[PDB]
Each structure stands twice: as C-alpha cells, then as structure tokens.
Structure 1
Amino acid sequence: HHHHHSDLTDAELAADLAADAGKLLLQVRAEIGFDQPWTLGEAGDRQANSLLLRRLQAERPGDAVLSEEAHDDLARLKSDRVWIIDPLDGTREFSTPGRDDWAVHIALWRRPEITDAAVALPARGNVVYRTDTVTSGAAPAGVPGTLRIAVSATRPPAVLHRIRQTLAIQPVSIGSAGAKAMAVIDGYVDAYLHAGGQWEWDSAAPAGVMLAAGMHASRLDGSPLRYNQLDPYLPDLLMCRAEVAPILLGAIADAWR
C-alpha cells in the first residue's frame, strides 16, 4: 500500500525490465552459443522482445509500446505514455564471443520528455543504469585539451573528420549505442557522437539516463532530441559531459562554414 505518489514506480519498472531482459539474453547466449552468430542474435532479439512485451502488457496495460522488434501500429501517437524499447542493442556484439558492449534499452516517454529510463549492460555484471539512481557532477579524469569520443560506424562520418582537423580527438570504438552512452556516464570517454541515422529506441533510454545525470544530450545542431515521432528515426546525436558540450557543438557548427 501507498508505494508511489501521484507495484513499481515507472523508474523501478524500467530498471526491473532491463535487468530481467538482460538475464534472459545471458541465458540465450549460454544456451545457443556462438557457432551461428545469426541464429544467436535472432533468438536474443526475439526472446527479449517477447519478455518485455509480456511484462509491459501485464504491468502497464494502458501504455503504448514502440519496440525495434515489433510492428508499430501508431496508436502511440495518441497516447500520453509510450515505452520506447530496444530489447537488444548491439545484436552483432551480443552474437560475438567475449564482447560485453551490448545493452538493453528501456525508456518511458511521457507527453514531452523521457521521464524514466534504464540501460542494462548484461555482460558487465548485469549493471543497470537508471534515471532514479544515476548521479551528476562527474569528473574529467584524463589529459586536458584532448577529447575521447565514442563512435561506431561501418565508416566514420564526414563531420568527425572535419572536427578532427580542429580539435584533438581520439575516437574510441565501442559497440552498441547503449555501451557508448554509458561510457560517457562512467567517464571512460568525454562524449558520444553519432551521425548518419539511428532509431528512437537506440537513444531514448541512454538520453534519459544522460539527462538525469546532469549531462548533455541533443541533436548535433544542439536542438532537443524528440521522441514518439511518426517516423521514429533520428538523423544524429551528441551525448557528453556538460563541460564539453559547447566545445563540441561549436566545432560541429563551425564544421559547416
């Protein structure tokens, strides 16, 4: 009784879903193994999605759900509450022996902000980053005047090449969006930069955690990340320590001179 003021809070549920899906993914990895990476990744995407949809229907039956692994009936556009989930972020990484840079993303959009969210990194001790416990005021623990930026693409974007002419940057290759964003939270890198396209579920939970931590999350041009859009595709993003946002936004802006 009287457990939450206006049964888990939305943040507690996000964290519990992320952890539960994380545990299931670890079970799938062990059961199926690594000999057929395609099969392994398919099973992870499918089984984590099934768990998350089952539990969201049981525990939040009134909420809409936008999942990478389910059809999108657009009822969410009428809803004031939408879960935006990536049941397995970094499917290729999950499918590769020894890789721990893959994630589960659970975000709640409320009409609008990402108000509650969790990112699990299941292979990293099933650590779950969550908007109700993550802390701010983190510290630059490396060399002054240089930036470490998490990136991951088939091929680096032109904007990165441009800003490297002006700023000392070491790109840090990390799998999945969630692992790159949590590297910022951890202080392992200063920033996470992506251009060239991404879906809402790749960034909604990381952005929620980033903003709850007092850090910066925006489009490359500095405008807010928008969610629950008809087309749930985001052309680009910057997530970073608050202190380096002006430096990087400025460099990106200058890159287009």
Structure 2
Amino acid sequence: HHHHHSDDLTDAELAADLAADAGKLLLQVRAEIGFDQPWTLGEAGDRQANSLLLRRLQAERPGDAVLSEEAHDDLARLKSDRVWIIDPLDGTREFSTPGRDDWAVHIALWRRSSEITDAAVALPARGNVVYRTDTVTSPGTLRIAVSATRPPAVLHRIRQTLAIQPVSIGSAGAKAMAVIDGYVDAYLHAGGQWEWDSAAPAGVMLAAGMHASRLDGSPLRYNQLDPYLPDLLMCRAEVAPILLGAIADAWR
C-alpha cells in the first residue's frame, strides 16, 4: 500500500530487479550449457535473457515500449513517452568464455522530456552486483578502458599527447562500471555501437555525477529511428575536459 509518489515497484526498482533476474537466469544458462560450444552458449544466453525481460516488461509495464537488441523493432517506440532500452546480455563473447566476468545486463528507461531517467547495470559473474540510478553514489597519467575486441583507432592519435594506458575489458557495461569503481579513469569507444550498449551505463554514469557524452561532447541521444550510436566518452567529471580537448585537437 502506497506505492510510490507522482508487483509494485518504482521504475528504478524495476530496472534493478529486471537486471538481477536476467543475471540469475544467465548464470543458470552458463552452468547448464557449459563452454564446449561457445556459439551455442552465447545464443542461449541472448535468447533466454531476452525472453525473460520481454515477458516481465509486458506483465509489469504493459503500456511501455521496448527496444531490445534481441527482438525486432516495430518503431512504435518513436511515438511513446516511455521506452525500455535493453541489452539482455552485453558481452556475449565474454559470457561464452570460461572464467570471464566482464559481461553485463543493461536495463534503461527512456522518458520523453520537454532522458534516461532510471537504469540498472548487472554484472552477474561479480556476485550479481547491480548498479542502479537510485543508489549509486556521487591527470598525470590516465587509465582508459577500451574494447578487448574492437578498440577505437582514435586512441592512437590522442596518445601522442596524453599519457594513457589502455585497459582491455569486454562489455560496455563492465567498462562503464569500472569507471564508477575507480578501476579506470575513463571509458572511450568509437567505431560503432547501439543504443542498448550505452543507455543503461549512461544513466548510471550521469546519476553518479560523472560524465557521459559523445566524443564531440554533445549529449547521448536515445530512442532514435536508427538506434546506431557509434561513439562515447564516460569518465570522471574532472577528466572530461582533458579528453574532450584531446579528441577535438586530434581533428582540426
């Protein structure tokens, strides 16, 4: 009784519960199927996590649109004021590899403003820790998390002027949460990505009072017709001017 203000969860509570629940299911799938066929393992994780998440979002938020990596996109979301942007399993490659803990579940709520208002990132292999927008708290040399698979070429240019050690990690969620944790100073990506890769990490990053933008400094924009969103910078606030500047100076 008495809900929240303005099966009875706030949007942030639901984001966190969805992320944890999908996390537990993924851990079950990993234990059941095992690692002999990494392709089969990854496919099962993607498909089963997606199924759980879509079932629960229909049951618990039947009026909300959903954009998932693992489902067709009917574009009804473009007319909605409330859109869940989900990556049922981010870092499928890493999930499918024995002993790797750098994979995530991304659950973001986009709300139309006159933008990512609530979000959670689960790292199921790290004790199923769930970072959430409603509980997350607020220069000589830089540690920068980059893709273990497709690191951005632009890094090479900025390293001519800034002392940087790249830290190879799988998953956008894992790299963003390494920034929150203080394991790295920044997460930098370019060369391609999708909205569900960055929406929940961005929500958490901004809620923690940290920086999250495009490489050119402009805001990350979601619920776009084309959900391709190819580059990002997520970092401590104090680090953003240094990196955005170096990126800008790499141009000219």
Interval of TM-score (by shorter of Structure 1 and Structure 2): over 0.9
Note closer, same or farther for the CA distance 1:156–1:175 as it changes in structure 2 (3 Å cut): closer
Deviation string 1:150-191 (CA, Å, 9 cap, x unpaired) is: 001545433100000000000000000000000000000000
Q: Give the C-alpha shift of residue 220 in structure 1.
A: 0.1
Q: Give the C-alpha shift of residue 235 in structure 1.
A: 2.0
Contact 2:148–2:169 (CA<8 Å) still a contact in 1?
A: no
C-alpha separation between the residues in 2 aligned to 1:156 and 1:123? 23
Residue-pair matches, total: 249
C-alpha separation between the residues in 2 aligned to 1:220 and 1:129? 24
Q: Which of structure 1's runs of 4+ aligned residues deviate more than 3 A?
A: 153-156
Counterpart of 1:197 in 2: which secondary structure? coil
Counterpart of 2:17 in 1: which secondary structure? helix
Deviation string 1:84-103 (CA, Å, 9 cap, x unpaired) is: 00000000000000000000
C-alpha separation between the residues in 1 aligned to 2:244 and 2:120? 26
The alignment's TM-score, normalised by the length of structure 1, stands at 0.96
Q: Give the C-alpha shift of residue 117 in structure 1.
A: 0.1
Contact 2:214–2:232 (CA<8 Å) still a contact in 1?
A: yes
C-alpha separation between the residues in 2 aligned to 1:150 and 1:197? 16
Alignment of 1:94-243 (within 5 A): 94-111=95-112, 113-136=115-138, 144-152=139-147, 154-243=149-238
C-alpha separation between the residues in 2 aligned to 1:116 and 1:155? 28
Contact 2:69–2:86 (CA<8 Å) still a contact in 1?
A: yes
Deviation string 1:12-67 (CA, Å, 9 cap, x unpaired) is: 00000000000000000000000000000000000000000000000000000000
C-alpha separation between the residues in 2 aligned to 1:233 and 1:217? 17
Contact 2:90–2:172 (CA<8 Å) still a contact in 1?
A: yes
Deviation string 1:101-152 (CA, Å, 9 cap, x unpaired) is: 00000000000x000000000000000000000001xxxxxxx500000001
Aligned alpha-carbon RMSD (Å): 0.7
Q: Give the C-alpha shift of residue 193 in structure 1.
A: 0.2
Contact 2:89–2:103 (CA<8 Å) still a contact in 1?
A: yes
C-alpha separation between the residues in 1 aligned to 2:53 and 2:229? 23
C-alpha separation between the residues in 2 aligned to 1:8 and 1:238? 31
Counterpart of 2:28 in 1: which secondary structure? helix
C-alpha separation between the residues in 1 aligned to 2:147 and 2:104? 15
Contact 2:85–2:196 (CA<8 Å) still a contact in 1?
A: yes
Note closer, same or farther for the CA distance 1:153–1:233 as it changes in structure 2 (3 Å cut): farther
